[PDB]
Design a binder for this molecule. Structure first.
Ligand SMILES: NC(=O)C1=CN([C@@H]2O[C@H](COP(=O)(O)OP(=O)(O)OC[C@H]3O[C@@H](n4cnc5c(N)ncnc54)[C@H](OP(=O)(O)O)[C@@H]3O)[C@@H](O)[C@H]2O)C=CC1
Ligand SMILES: NC(=O)C1=CN([C@@H]2O[C@H](COP(=O)(O)OP(=O)(O)OC[C@H]3O[C@@H](n4cnc5c(N)ncnc54)[C@H](OP(=O)(O)O)[C@@H]3O)[C@@H](O)[C@H]2O)C=CC1
Ligand SMILES: NC(=O)C1=CN([C@@H]2O[C@H](COP(=O)(O)OP(=O)(O)OC[C@H]3O[C@@H](n4cnc5c(N)ncnc54)[C@H](OP(=O)(O)O)[C@@H]3O)[C@@H](O)[C@H]2O)C=CC1
Ligand SMILES: NC(=O)c1ccc[n+]([C@@H]2O[C@H](COP(=O)([O-])OP(=O)(O)OC[C@H]3O[C@@H](n4cnc5c(N)ncnc54)[C@H](OP(=O)(O)O)[C@@H]3O)[C@@H](O)[C@H]2O)c1
Ligand SMILES: Fc1ccc(F)c(C2=NCCC2)c1
Ligand SMILES: Fc1ccc(F)c(C2=NCCC2)c1
Ligand SMILES: Fc1ccc(F)c(C2=NCCC2)c1
Ligand SMILES: Fc1ccc(F)c(C2=NCCC2)c1
Lengths: 286, 285, 287, 287
């Protein structure tokens, strides 16, 4: 049942990915720019391909966990011709356009690229609650969907490889902003005698109440309802200025809070003070 | 339920007034835009003619204003009658300006209890909602049960600025994620997707955040910035991917650019092989 | 596009699921033994199927909100043959074993059962603040995940159909116990002149401090560390005995507090009095 | 200046009490039966009285952190002739009647007992978010309220010492039951390959969703609205029966789920099957 596969890219994610596959009983062949990284997996039952050309040729499925799509060209460029009949599932982050450019390159060499965006940390590889967006030619994705179901759940977003990257970037823009806000909160807390452990209960309660506002503002934004019934930008403009000045009074970097105040200053200049802060989506759109 | 005066009838004060009447509190209500008091007045609320009478009607005066500067503008005319009053200011501000309002209320013979409501107006009334309180314990304890009608009470200490600090610690994370939601909806609008099409993923992503908050918590507390799970260099690429995805789709790039620049400052600080958590040191400045 | 689906089981949960699905623009075919319960959803724009067979026939996705899995055998029983090609999402509570058996029943009739456990009340259907456990054939779940996301978030726990039920019963043993304790708190308060409103703030402060104790005792239980550093069982056996006698002295039924006292005394009898109350997990690990 | 005081009872809670009193600057005289427990506080500056009598006579304010009120009689009984003019703040859990019995015994010996229910773990002593119910002589409590604020917030519930104990037991019937539910969930999990750390997110999510039901059912119990618009006791009896059989099938102890099942079966027999489980608040008024 568990089909063989080549995994190139053995960082935090691909290492855990190879673990989850060998665990299920898959035929793992691992290659990496840093060949030292392919050693614990190789000791657990994986074959070190001596070259990327041999890696690409060992199996039909080539899974990629690299920092970006440029890393793919740099690793598979030496073996470009060996990509014929091969299916490259790139679980690497990049722009939809750069994701499609990768697909085109694999396509010039007789292979098909399936894009992928894992929405889980390395600890989540092998966990059923973990999911990944996938996009690109259906047949190639479908004939490997079950080996990919070993890593995460499969959410097909379309035939355009760019869609999986677009959906990953949609969730990551919220993830990174919230996590930079955590780092900002931890820094304000350290400047005030507190630890991340002291502010963790509140932080978690704060981010878990977020889905309410996500729903509250979804339909309202999709209809142009930016009424000040639950909030006025003017009140929130004061709120973000309070974060900036509280941070400044406590000696904490003000670059990120000053950039947030600037966005609210643009909303005030657009006449949105009596409207919901949601109105500022019209400054981000188009 | 003990009687009280509530000044500040915007989105939250309106909800607070509805909740105080719902428990049974006799309410004296005043607002600069007196038009915003009509509904609560018909529900049974006495419309104080002026702020002076509002303050004199009850010991407890709860303020729901945009900032602490609004209290000076509203209570300042009748600051003489603030003597013997407990002012529960539920208005956001910096700890230092919250402390200034405490001194101001105290110079007028009163006591300020600082408050930061960590709930929307729709949550006023539910013990699922919480608010930070700070300032003289005695005055807090005296009026804690009237405050429990609006929200649960989370006392953060006798320094009135403490509730404001705790509120700002949550709101930096709250506003950042909500601004990110606005960026996701614009990226989606530019790609034929509505917010309702992206709301599930957005809600799944923000709901998984508590795990990542705990994972990096004790690590940051102990100084562990290992790239065992994440390298700042891959995150710099990830946030740059966000920037160019936004730029390629025609969406505003101001906020993605500030994040890219923050990660590049971290790479310049030598934390490329370390976890993105390492940039907490550049924020401690 | 909002995919069409059939909803059988229009109790408090099923009525709310119908309203949420209609709110997203889903084409809903509905059926309930009591047809008056389908009236409002029909007037909103739902199709009132006359038979249970016709409801199952109308759409591939059949969502069940029934009391138990025995109720699926009763309702879908007549037209079991016509369950072929259909994906039955069973959001009914039951034992992992009974849930697994329902999957085999749906499968022996040509269908696929996705098991589901809604961790929200009816007021939470439609909210992305709400979540539901799902388990069963991965392909069917992925094909219908988006229509189910209209009701709650999706927490897939695996291919074993009994896994959603297990995870649901794990949350429900804590849920029911905390809520039966709230009822006992309300009854002790009434017996002492206090209304539920008077005890609600303290009750909500008590349950909001719980996540701290769940974490505190998690690593300790998983590591076998049941030391009396923060609590000794004998101090807790006294505390549960205080609740019991406080309730007996107040004329409140003592059946539920006698059971808790009996459980703490079992730990004392097994030698765990100087150990944490957490040690009593070792008495539960066996039947 | 932080007023001086005597602390007797240096277990998990008392040690944390002494640490917080010393942290603020209180002249602390400590005494514990197991002397080793004062050792660290004495190096921090705690006096260490030679015996219990010397401790009671050192200060007007004597704080007790013992397992129960029977422990007070056995410790303060040999030093009973020294209790006159002394304010004994007893932070020990016990029933309202036994707390009033301690108040009477203290007053027969010339002193005044103030009852206290600390609704904070030892980790929360010294924390401003922490609270304690207090009941007993108002003036004596008011004279010593500032020193008691060092440990926790002070919520005076009245002149009867039984009021604090009652308020403490009202919260602890809910707390203990939710913790026994957590222990049951961890056992169900262990029998199914899952650790407490694996179920901790769902457990924490389940218990943070409780404050909604507390308010929802508080408003309805107070108004006699035990309608089944959001639930039926019959659907709940099935749910609790599923917890019992899920635990039995997994070889997990059934004594506790059997008692919940028995109470739900008592409600269906009382004619409440079509009503909310909240109707069982009435079964709790008739033993
Ligand atoms: N959901 C929410 O709105 C939340 C807000 N908060 C905080 O609660 C507070 C109230 O916010 P919100 O309910 O939106 O109300 P607003 O901030 O929109 O306004 C609150 C009240 O303050 C009055 N006010 C504003 N400026 C002045 C001034 N210069 N002088 C006198 N009165 C003034 C308004 O007057 P008028 O109506 O007469 O024009 C209104 O009655 C804020 O500090 C906010 O940060 C906390 C949590 C969530
Ligand atoms: N109630 C809640 O808050 C929550 C409950 N759940 C779960 O959701 C499920 C649905 O329960 P809920 O809708 O709340 O309430 P009910 O259990 O009362 O509703 C279930 C349905 O069963 C139907 N039914 C009655 N008799 C039979 C029968 N003989 N054969 C088949 N079906 C029958 C009822 O129809 P009729 O109108 O004719 O009686 C009703 O539509 C349960 O399994 C429960 O554990 C989980 C989340 C929250
Ligand atoms: N998390 C918690 O533990 C909380 C507990 N409480 C309540 O606070 C009280 C104390 O808590 P905790 O410290 O855990 O309790 P313990 O029972 O673990 O210890 C309390 C102290 O009582 C002393 N003691 C008991 N009997 C006698 C006696 N006959 N003579 C002299 N000393 C005696 C013990 O002295 P020795 O060292 O010699 O045994 C010990 O120091 C209890 O009533 C408890 O219900 C409330 C809030 C939280
Ligand atoms: N880490 C997470 O938590 C997480 C979760 C989901 C998504 N992701 C995405 O998953 C991908 C992998 O992230 P990661 O943290 O596991 O790993 P990473 O730190 O991005 O490194 C992954 C791999 O990329 C290789 N690589 C990087 N640049 C290269 C180049 N120019 N040429 C050749 N190889 C190159 C590295 O090779 P060496 O071994 O030689 O260094 C390494 O094996 C990223 O695209 C990321 O956005 C991250
Ligand atoms: F949940 C997710 C999803 C995608 C991710 F890249 C992450 C990361 N964790 C550490 C850095 C990226 C977490
Ligand atoms: F829209 C707004 C504006 C300001 C706010 F503080 C909020 C909040 N909701 C709960 C956290 C604060 C929402
Ligand atoms: F949040 C939840 C989850 C599952 C449930 F069964 C409930 C219930 N509410 C009333 C009884 C069962 C609530
Ligand atoms: F482990 C225990 C034992 C007895 C207790 F009272 C407590 C707590 N009380 C307030 C919350 C924790 C914890």
């Amino acid at each position: 049942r568990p089909a063989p596969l080549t995994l190139i890219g053995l960082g935090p994610m691909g290492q855990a990915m190879g673990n989850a596959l060998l665990d299920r009983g898959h035929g793992l062949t691992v290659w990496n720019r840093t060949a030292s990284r392919a050693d614990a997996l190789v000791e657990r039952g994986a074959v070190r391909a001596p070259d990327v050309a041999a890696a690409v040729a060992a199996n039909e499925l080539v899974v990629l966990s690299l920092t970006d799509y440029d890393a793919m060209y740099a690793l598979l460029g030496p073996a470009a011709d060996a990509l014929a009949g091969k299916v490259v599932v790139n679980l690497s982050s990049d722009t939809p356009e750069k994701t499609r450019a990768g697909a085109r390159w694999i396509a010039e060499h007789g292979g098909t690229l399936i894009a992928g965006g894992v929405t889980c940390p390395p600890s989540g590889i092998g966990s059923p609650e973990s999911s990944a967006f996938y996009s690109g030619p259906s047949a190639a994705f479908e004939r490997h969907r079950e080996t990919l179901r070993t890593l995460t759940r499969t959410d097909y977003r379309g035939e355009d490889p760019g869609l999986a990257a677009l959906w990953y970037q949609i969730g990551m823009v919220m993830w990174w902003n919230a996590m930079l806000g955590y780092l900002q909160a931890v820094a304000l807390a350290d400047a005030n005698g507190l630890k991340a452990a002291d502010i963790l209960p509140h932080a978690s309660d704060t981010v878990a109440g977020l889905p309410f506002f996500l729903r509250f503002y979804a339909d309202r934004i999709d209809t142009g309802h930016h009424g000040g019934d639950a909030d006025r930008l003017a009140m929130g403009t004061a709120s973000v200025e309070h974060i900036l000045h509280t941070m400044a009074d406590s000696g904490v970097d003000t670059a990120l809070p000053e950039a947030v105040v600037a966005f609210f200053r643009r909303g005030e200049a657009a006449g949105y003070a009596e409207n919901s802060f949601s109105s500022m989506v019209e400054l981000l759109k188009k």
